[PDB]
Curated annotation (Swiss-Prot):
Phenotype upon changing I166L: In R10-3; matures to the red-emitting state with excitation and emission maxima at 555 and 585 nm, respectively
Effect on the protein upon substituting V219R: In Azurite; shifts the excitation and emission spectra to shorter wavelengths and increases quantum yields compared to BFP
GO annotation terms (biological process): bioluminescence; generation of precursor metabolites and energy
Uses described in the biotechnology field: Green fluorescent protein has been engineered to produce a vast number of variously colored mutants, fusion proteins, and biosensors. Further generation of mutants led to more stable proteins (at 37 degrees Celsius for example) with brighter fluorescence and longer fluorescence lifetimes.
Originating species: Aequorea victoria (Water jellyfish)
Tagged with keyword Nucleotidyltransferase: no
Name of protein: Green fluorescent protein
Its job: Energy-transfer acceptor. Its role is to transduce the blue chemiluminescence of the protein aequorin into green fluorescent light by energy transfer. Fluoresces in vivo upon receiving energy from the Ca(2+)-activated photoprotein aequorin.
Length: 222
């Protein structure tokens, strides 16, 4: 199926075009994924200079098709079944007591490369808040994602919270609303409701002088 496109190591390209409170920025990312292990490694670069938001706030936006679905679950892997034509992924992300991101992405194969091409629009942020003021720690608290079928849109939806550590204490909440719809006309497996579990690790490359994020991620269904 589309699952057959994921039995090996797959190069990943990520491209993001963003505007948060008028700060226009661009992120490009490259790496690879191996769904057999649910493993992702990726380096992101802010190609327009300094990133105007903290890197952790972009993690969820910057490929759930790479999750390890155990054999008894492969039947519900909407994300792979939509390949290679892919799927649109849309989110609104509300930052508590601050602004919100609206994102639209196409995830699809371009040849042998899995590509995630994103537009991001952030509005109504506080210029001195936790996001625009760079007050978030450079780490991550993952959260499980309850993927639910949305029969009417022949796709899936989800809603989940991410907690971002604020420097010196406390947590900045990011309330995620998500929906995904297939791009192709093919047959697509609408899944039974289930969770995706993710563990992310953020680091830096000591040889990289541009504003950047190295990201290691494992994701598995259950």
């Amino acid at each position: 199926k589309g699952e057959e496109l994921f039995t090996g190591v797959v190069p990943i390209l990520v491209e993001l075009d963003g505007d948060v409170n008028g700060h226009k920025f661009s992120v490009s990312g490259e790496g690879e994924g191996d769904a057999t292990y649910g493993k992702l490694t990726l380096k992101f670069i802010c190609t327009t200079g300094k990133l105007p938001v903290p890197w952790p706030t972009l993690v969820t936006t910057l490929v759930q098709c790479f999750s390890r679905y155990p054999d008894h679950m492969k039947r519900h892997d909407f994300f792979k079944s939509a390949m290679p034509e892919g799927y649109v992924q849309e989110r609104t992300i509300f930052f508590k007591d601050d602004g919100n991101y609206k994102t639209r992405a196409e995830v699809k194969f371009e040849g042998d490369t899995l590509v995630n091409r994103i537009e991001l629009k952030g509005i109504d942020f506080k210029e001195d808040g936790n996001i625009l003021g760079h007050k978030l720690e450079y780490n991550y608290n993952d959260h499980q994602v309850y993927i639910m079928a949305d029969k009417q849109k022949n796709g899936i939806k989800a809603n989940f919270k991410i907690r971002h550590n604020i420097e010196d204490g406390g947590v900045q909440l990011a309330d995620h609303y998500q929906q995904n719809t297939p791009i192709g006309d093919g047959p697509v497996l609408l899944p039974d409701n289930h969770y995706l579990f993710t563990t992310s690790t953020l680091s830096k490359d000591p040889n990289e002088k541009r504003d950047h994020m190295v990201l290691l991620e494992f994701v598995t269904a259950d």
